[PDB]
């Protein structure tokens, strides 16, 4: 099996990397098999994961060994998630991580400011299509000096001592990086409103200055958000908490503005999904039925407005439902029912057996931590989609 | 001696680092001694150099071993310079380099786009006051993807396959990084005028949006440069070829706009120094006599560097850089002694030649023409006159 | 293809490693395909080669870039060879290299004394069955301090500034290391006879002291060699120039004593093969016919006497014929004829097309450097074998 | 100060190295100052420590972070000791460590079999006089394959999962390595008596075969030890538990055979020191009074170390090591002052307590019982009396 072959061939530089492999790689290889990646792509991705991702993941938190840096990405504080993006026809595997520098969570690096850019630099000599210009732009806008980072750690819980995180889409035989920047540490430290920081950083992008359509989309977005998020410097949800970009040509990159809120009823779902009455068309409304049916059939909620250069009109967001604390057997039964509702008969018939087989060390009918998030979207061109985000480590124990 | 002691204590991870040390570290230790750094600071800076700078310098170009990446920083293609900044009261040592990545000058990294940021990342965990925000800003504005980098190499000579370089001021017991970004590769690849892209990148700075004084200074600078540099996309002089920042809090960083030109007579020196008649005050005019006297007392382009700081609205006179490559180093030393006497820097005059000899003991500096590379001169209202001398250390040692 | 997939997944830490891959890995993957290794084993070996062997190979000598260390292993000074061991039924791929330290061929490391042990140390945490005790034993016996190493470089050509080299058999899904130690630098520097050094080092082995059979074999070997090699300190072939061991349990390791000579006529072949009349049995004589037929159908010659603990009697040696300077098209036609002589019809029918396909950048009917060595052996239990050693780099240009 | 200056210049690759430095480097710099090393040598040894020793020390065991490998070298499981060797005329500083590989104490490396040789390889390219031949010889004789290593861990406590450790004498402006190999894991796994395997490994040395004097010394040693240590495979005292060599030319290396025992009265001290009546001369007998006086003036085993050199046929008296773990460090200091007065080392007596305090400023050394770990004493005919004091640096700093 590819994960086993690579272990045999490569070994491990240190014990932390060995443990990360022993607790994630079998699962990943299972995911890639189940999403119908060829064997050559299984090897591609697993070898990549070994060489580039294992060293970025830092120490493997476990009984008796408490890392200086604790991630918010998972229940046990491990900076890793594996996610699937499901259509009608295909499923795509993705990794989400924080790349942990070797002084992270200590005075020389209080918010783990460097690990993600170091990974991306390695990715840029590895991969011909990786572009760091949007990364560098937002790092310059929302990054903090060391003194500022220290101040931020006094005002945030241990699981939120971070500015950046990274995802890698394993798609089209390639690795496609995306990054997300948190606005919160900068908001806190400079006592600037999150709304102003977020849009100030966006409006200084080189692509913003060249693309009139993007400027039109953002002004619509701004007009929707301005009345709904704080005008002052509080961290009072609903709030503009992350900015997302693809690490590709800035003209092709999607710009992502993520709201976080703890409150989500039907009125709020409607309001977010339709941008307050702005989107009334039949595609948007079909999406909204889907989201409402999902809520019925079933950490902050997330609303992610994604914009692309050359497009003047906003689309409906992706909405993220937190699943931490809900039984994983129930979630699986709920998703099967939702998949039948969508007419995704093949996804419905396989979901629960393939979930078991991803996570053989665990009884999903007893766990509550393995599904962490679910995102749903509807695109005008691409159709409906579902993202399921798993705490791999929780599922491997 | 410190450079010897660190060799014995540290050794070398590879032969290229050993050769770098053997061709630069004696000289550097000499310079620090001559600028009256304490012994503890000599160790501090030499140990730092060994740990952080040696691995960043790449292969040591020499007969039989042609690196894939050739730097424009020195005559022999070595990515290193050492410079001294001389006042009346003190002398400061500084290093200039390019941090060479391990695939530099090959298809995976045609313009050496990553080494400098990697060095700076290491400097940020080392040093409590290092800030990368201006670095990242300009890297986003003037940097290029791989395909663009490959295009750029087809339009530039081998010595100009670069976007960034780094300097380290060894001052106040600290290491203070500065970086410089070339506008040329982006100008060439996007077929944009250098003036436009330089100012477009500056005007998108976070500090530009917060600081009215800086905007005002740049607006005056723009009015002066717009008529004097190309409005088209040519690389002809005078041109806006580099943008410089300090890797510190953006509010305290100096923003530097560097012109390169090959033509420099007395009228041009006047025009640059006074910003075309804009500066007429007595401090400016004293600076101008000094610079005129230097030009009289004495290939690469001339440089003119306008340096602007947040919170200051008015432009100051630039620093002017005289190129010295190809002029005998014994002559340059005699000229500098005379200039130092003119300034009333009697102590600097009396020591300059003997210290020059002692900086470069393994080569007869009176026979060479490549060791002094540049000379910069400035006058500040608050600081007084200054001189920067930039040496091709490797040419002084091989 | 696996070599391509790994390139894509892994990239390269530096340009030298990239060039080594671009000039050897396609060939290796071709060899492994032709010897019928499964795809999973192709990935195993190619991933291993990338992680462990590429960094050990040092700079890639090429026009404009002259390394400080020049290896004798190949025509262009590259420290690599790939070899095949051919039976009737199977073919085994092996790598031979010198692991180049980062100060090799300079004053801090004049004979490249450290790179091979550093590779083996990495192999010992990678592989459960690797044993370093025989390595360390012979390193202690024939290794030299820095001053001695400097003296040795003044008395040897640049291509002989070495004490150790390494081979890796790619067999049974495993990597099996072997090492060879040169007696010459120590002989030269201490003005000790090679015969005395070689046997002194052997007789101080822990296994020699425990195994009466081995002591009996070596005393027979000593009685054969003593009259035929110098009693003085000259490097006058025939001479005892290398000692070989397997990096496994000392009780299972074969101990190999290699003679080098520039003179090889029928009388000498006979004398070496039969240990001077000592071996007269029908197995030995069939071997000898085979070797004689090979010579007829077609750097020093090599004679390698291999002994194993628990066996009191000597076996016939392996004899190594240097092929440098003989046309590679001719060698292929000669080997095809020899394979027919042996009744290895399948090996005969495939040898020349598979040779072409290993080395697609080159016209074998014009080159003289690609076959470097041929070894032949006959074992009482295992049967006849042939080892062919290729200059991979010469074959890739 | 040098330890501060190197921190500022070098920083740390990871937090474990930072913590090591923060808990040992001040103390080390203190020791070097107190032994009258020049400032240049302080830098030399501190820079060396940073580059070569910090990464070899592994994780820094502390509350909340339990490393996979736990060393027996110190009370807190930290693989480091600092020791001073005191004469009448000088004091020499030495480091003892285990070089912790990155899979140590796990299935891929159960007895930490590789870190020490990796450090020594780095030392061989650093230092012109380092020689690995004796290291490799004993590693071949007493080392174990992985399966054997896993068996050994089932028969030994966690603090004894080791085969090798390393010491570095900081002497003559140089670093001189020594290594020690434990015979215990091989004794246990092969069910061989410790006496037999110790001498079997020694007798296969290349130098043993060339040097009649060394063979004669060992033959006398064997006659003395054979009746006193087990003839069976038990780990009971007295036992031959370590073999020591210098990593230098085998002809100049001292070969050290160390006994460990828990029982030490005046008759036993006499028996060990005189090799059972074998040594009766006036130098030996003066040494013996000294050692008797030390025992009177004052848990781990006692150590007795017989040290033999090629070209010497006759045995000398051993060095005897008194274990001090569990005895108050204020008391030990008062005892040593008294012993120093007895020796007529008035200067050593007058400074010992104040320097002890200043070596360990972040802990009150009068309250601790773990800081002095061992005391060794020797007498040479050619060299005079000596004392080695071994400190648990980490226990003195945390
Ligand atoms: C960081 C979290 C929990 C979600 C980010 S939204 P995403 O990038 O995972 O979703 P897409 O890949 O854009 O479909
Ligand atoms: C890199 C070159 C040739 C010139 C840079 S100007 P500088 O930064 O060296 O001069 P100052 O340090 O600003 O005085
Ligand atoms: C070093 C050279 C050219 C030959 C060594 S003999 P070998 O080990 O390659 O042959 P075997 O693998 O023992 O059949
Ligand atoms: C490692 C331990 C506890 C004792 C070793 S004896 P030593 O080598 O430290 O003493 P000397 O350096 O030989 O004086």
Write up what this structure looks like.
4 copies of one chain form a homotetramer. The first copy, chain A, is of the alpha+beta class and 397 residues long. Chain A has one domain (1-397). Chain A is 41% helix and 19% strand. Chain A has 14 helices and 10 strands. The first copy, chain A, has a 10-stranded antiparallel barrel with strand order 1-2-3-4-5-6-7-8-9-10, surrounded by 7 helices. In chain A, α1 packs across α3 (39-53), α2 packs antiparallel against α3 (39-53) and α5 packs antiparallel against α8. The C-D interface holds C 101, 103, 108-109, 113-114, 117-118, 121, 124-126, 128, 131-137, 139-141, 143, 145-147, 200, 204-206, 209, 249 and D 101, 103, 108-109, 113-114, 117-118, 121, 124-126, 128-137, 139-141, 143, 145-147, 200, 204-206, 209, 249. Bound molecules: dimethylallyl S-thiolodiphosphate (4 copies). One dimethylallyl S-thiolodiphosphate binds next to β2, β3 and β4 of chain D.
Structural category of chain A: alpha+beta
N-to-C SSE series of chain A? HHHEEHHHEEHHHHEEHHEEHHEE
Please report the distance between the alpha carbons of the first and last residues of chain A. 21 Å
Helix fraction bin of chain A: 40-55%
The greatest interface between two protein chains, and residues involved on each side, is: A-B, 33 and 35 residues
Order of strands, widest sheet of chain A: 1-2-3-4-5-6-7-8-9-10
Bound molecules: dimethylallyl S-thiolodiphosphate
Strand content of chain A: 15-25%
Largest sheet of chain A, described in full?
Answer: 10 strands, antiparallel, barrel
Q: Which radius of gyration of chain A do the C-alpha atoms yield? A: 20 Å
User: What does the overall shape of chain A look like?
Assistant: globular
Number of domains of chain A: 1
Say how many strands of chain A there are: 10
Quaternary structure type:
homotetramer
Task: Enumerate how many helices of chain A there are, as a single number.
Answer: 14
PDB class: transferase
Keywords: substrate promiscuity, ABBA fold, transferase
Assembly: tetrameric
Entry title: Crystal structure of the aromatic prenyltransferase AtaPT from Aspergillus terreus A8-4 in complex with dimethylallyl S-thiolodiphosphate
